[PDB]
Amino acid sequence: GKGCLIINEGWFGHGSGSISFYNYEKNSIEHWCYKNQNFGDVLGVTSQSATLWNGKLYVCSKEDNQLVVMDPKTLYAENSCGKLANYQAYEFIGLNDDYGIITHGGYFSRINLKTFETITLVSVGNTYTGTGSGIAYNGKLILNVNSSGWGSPKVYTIDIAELCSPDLKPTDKVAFQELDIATYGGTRFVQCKDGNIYTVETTKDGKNNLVRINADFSLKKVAMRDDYSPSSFGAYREASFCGTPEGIFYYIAGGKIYKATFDNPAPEETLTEYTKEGYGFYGAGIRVNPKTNELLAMYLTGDYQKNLLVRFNAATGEKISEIAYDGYYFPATFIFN
Numbered sequence: 001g002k003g004c005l006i007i008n009e010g011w012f013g014h015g016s017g018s019i020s021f022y023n024y025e026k027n028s029i030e031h032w033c034y035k036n037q038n039f040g041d042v043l044g045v046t047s048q049s050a051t052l053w054n055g056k057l058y059v060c061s062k063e064d065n066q067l068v069v070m071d072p073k074t075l076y077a078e079n080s081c082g083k084l085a086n087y088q089a090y091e092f093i094g095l096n097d098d099y100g101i102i103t104h105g106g107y108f109s110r111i112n113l114k115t116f117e118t119i120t121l122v123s124v125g126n127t128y129t130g131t132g133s134g135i136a137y138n139g140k141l142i143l144n145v146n147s148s149g150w151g152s153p154k155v156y157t158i159d160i161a162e163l164c165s166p167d168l169k170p171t172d173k174v175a176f177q178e179l180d181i182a183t184y185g186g187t188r189f190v191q192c193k194d195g196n197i198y199t200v201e202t203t204k205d206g207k208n209n210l211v212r213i214n215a216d217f218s219l220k221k222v223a224m225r226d227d228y229s230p231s232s233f234g235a236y237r238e239a240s241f242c243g244t245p246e247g248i249f250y251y252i253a254g255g256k257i258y259k260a261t262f263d264n265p266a267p268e269e270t271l272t273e274y275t276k277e278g279y280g281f282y283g284a285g286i287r288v289n290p291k292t293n294e295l296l297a298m299y300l301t302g303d304y305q306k307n308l309l310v311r312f313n314a315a316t317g318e319k320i321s322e323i324a325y326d327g328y329y330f331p332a333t334f335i336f337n
């Protein structure tokens with residue numbers, strides 16, 4: 001069936017995160033989709049992020065069941081990992097066939113994708129401040145470090161081959177370089193068909209730059225809208241910044257959706273002026289499906305009891321559909337398969 005997955009934080013203090021399914025053909029929402037496919041097994045507490053990697057869906061939770069690896073189509077569990085570490089799991093970042101990264105509120109971990117052995121790296125620069133998103137690119141991990149913490153760490157690059165050493169120990173001072181990309185909050189990484197990476201700098205003074213990272217790791221910057229906000233490391237969520245392989249980017253700025261490019265990074269024109277009265281953005285806020293030309297938007301009310309998903313045309317901004325539903329879900333992000 002045509003649709004999208006919604007990763008839910010879940011109701012902190014009351015139950016787990018969960019996976020909902022917005023069926024577009026039915027214009028219906030189905031809840032607890034992982035649970036109902038896996039004989040009552042559940043995600044952890046605060047399911048914040050998921051990642052597609054080598055045909056599997058990795059779903060992170062901050063606490064308890066910190067990682068579930070599942071089939072993207074069926075949601076049948078490959079591995080329900082339980083607690084990986086004494087650090088909160090934020091995101092999964094793929095390195096290769098053998099290894100991934102788990103980001104945290106302080107440090108980051110290497111995870112073996114066969115065994116689930118989790119090694120937390122405690123002496124890699126100022127990654128003690130927290131790690132957000134990241135991406136594997138041209139033999140390097142590009143890592144969103146919490147620039148708001150002590151020492152103002154900028155984006156790190158780390159050699160994947162060094163990270164993937166079979167002799168890696170938690171105290172190894174794995175070499176890094178800093179890129180000139182301040183990330184005072186959480187950012188995201190988009191790979192385009194040019195073979196470059198796109199991300200969002202947010203500086204100490206709150207200026208937002210769209211940053212192209214080249215295959216050489218040299219930078220080109222252009223100013224985004226000043227009213228763009230990253231996600232806060234105070235309560236880590238995936239940032240709103242996303243985009244297509246064609247170089248069309250989307251972000252939330254001043255509570256409105258913008259379509260942007262590298263040539264038009266700070267648009268005055270919105271994608272849409274859509275509101276529903278008393279619904280505000282939550283979680284990641286937006287994600288684009290490049291395969292369908294669809295932008296999905298997630299909202300809830302001020303008391304968190306009522307939820308809204310809206311599906312737009314990603315080119316023109318016209319509303320295709322919406323669905324309103326009750327419950328303490330706290331939507332985190334969208335996944336398209």
Ligand code: CNC
Pocket residue numbers: 009010011012013014045046048062063233234235236237303304329330
């Ligand atoms: C609103 C909110 C929320 N909060 Co606060 C945020 N942002 N929060 C707040 C505020 C509560 C009061 C208010 N203004 O309504 C506010 C700003 C004070 C707060 C505070 C904090 N929050 C924090 C975080 C990280 C979190 N918060 C969430 C619970 C995050 C929530 C999201 C979620 N998925 O649950 C959240 C969006 C919704 C809570 C709610 O209204 N639920 C409905 C209500 C009917 O249920 P309830 O059981 O009575 O809710 C109570 C608890 O949620 C409690 N509480 C709230 N946050 C925390 C955090 C912890 C660690 C603990 C033990 C309790 C809480 O306060 C609520 C009383 O109204 C969280 C899941 C968000 C996220 N997705 O990461 C997350 C906890 C993750 C985890 N598994 O540990 C802070 C550490 C932020 C910071 N750096 O200061 C801090 C810790 C407070 C503490 N207890 O020590």
